[PDB]
């Protein structure tokens, strides 16, 4: 008798306040780290190695993402009251930065694989295309993020407060499912495959080495891979669960809706730390950048 009835989208103020605080703290930390990395790299042009270019681009991407964060914090505070143009611009910038960061992690992994595995051979001469590779990655991210620019507008509803959602048509609900295949395919699967292959073979070659400092290199490689997974796995898992729920593959209940809806925000908050942990994981863990920072202090 009581099976059929409306489901109320539920929320709590504590979550809003917590999200605001976390977003602000992450903004500050990412800004500081990225600014320091850029200052260290650009100050002196001595030894502008490929890794320096890659770290520069990665820091720029993270800095832009952090710059866009605060508007997202306000949106979470009260929904998108900031207008349609800001929705389009902010969404474009956010998606472009996210794609570029992921694909730049992939490219850094490719560089390391071609540097430590194929080190004795002449293939190592093919890693001097950092300019072209970086430009291509930025262009591909830009092209892949245009669906956000074209098909995002403020959406109004009687029970739901404004939010910068998609407007693709009256059957947009299904269309968003197809759109989601992009971030979950060239955003987690391809990058994870490339990183796994590259770092696995790098680990093999290092494990077959008699060097004096194999230990720290292995630790840092494992740290990078585990940090990437810990950062991005939950968001993709929850996204796949949500898509399956909308496909009616998994039985759908109001409480399941609420659970997945809260989990989405929690996982986004956790994942956003990719802009904050990158400077330590990739750059400051090496003696070169610490030495450069100390030298600049004069």
């Amino acid at each position: 008798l009581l099976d059929a009835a409306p489901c109320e989208p539920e929320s709590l103020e504590i979550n809003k306040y917590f999200v605001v605080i976390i977003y602000a703290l992450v903004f500050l930390l990412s800004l500081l780290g990225n600014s320091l990395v850029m200052l260290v790299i650009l100050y002196s042009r001595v030894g502008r190695s490929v890794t320096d270019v890659y770290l520069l681009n990665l820091a720029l991407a993270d800095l832009l993402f952090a710059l866009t964060l605060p508007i997202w914090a306000a949106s979470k505070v009260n929904g998108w009251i900031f207008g349609t143009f800001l929705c389009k611009v902010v969404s474009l910038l956010k998606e472009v930065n996210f794609y570029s960061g992921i694909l730049l992690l992939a490219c850094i992994s490719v560089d390391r694989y071609l540097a430590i595995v194929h080190a004795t051979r002449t293939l190592t001469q093919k890693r001097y295309l950092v300019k072209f590779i970086c430009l291509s990655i930025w262009g591909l991210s830009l092209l892949l993020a245009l669906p956000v620019l074209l098909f995002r507008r403020t959406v109004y509803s009687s029970n739901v407060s404004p939010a910068c959602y998609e407007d693709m048509g009256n059957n947009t609900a299904n269309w968003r499912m197809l759109l989601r295949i992009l971030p979950q395919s060239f955003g987690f699967i391809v990058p994870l495959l490339i990183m796994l292959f590259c770092y696995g073979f790098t680990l093999r070659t290092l494990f077959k080495a008699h060097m004096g400092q194999k230990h720290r290199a292995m630790r840092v490689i494992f740290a990078v891979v585990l940090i990437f997974l810990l950062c991005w796995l939950p968001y993709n898992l929850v996204l796949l669960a949500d898509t399956l729920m909308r496909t009616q593959v998994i039985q759908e209940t109001c409480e399941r809706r609420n659970h997945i809806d809260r989990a989405l925000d929690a996982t986004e908050i956790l994942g956003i730390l990719h802009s904050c942990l990158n400077p330590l994981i990739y750059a400051f863990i090496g003696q070169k950048f610490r030495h450069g920072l100390l030298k600049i202090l004069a």
């Binding site: 099976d3 059929a4 009835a5 409306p6 489901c7 989208p9 929320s11 809003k16 979470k76 009260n78 929904g79 507008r153 959406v155 509803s157 009687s158 029970n159 739901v160 407060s161 939010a163 959602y165 998609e166 407007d167 693709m168 009256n170 059957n171 947009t172 609900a173 299904n174 949500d242 909308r246 759908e252 209940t253 109001c254 809706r257 809806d261 989405l264 925000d265």
Partner: protein, 65 residues
Amino acid sequence: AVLTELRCTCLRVTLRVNPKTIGKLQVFPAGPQCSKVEVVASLKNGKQVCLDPEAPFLKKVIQKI
């Protein structure tokens, strides 16, 4: 309220209802929020139900709107 993934307002439909017991009626047309048209009837006892937009009587009532 607050939401990042907008979803349909009804999961299942009711075909057993009396017009007199209905207190308020609202119509949600298809749009960016949900694919299927929704008709919500809030009864006089505080209970709310979702009705079939394709039902002949309800379809005519909605069209008249």
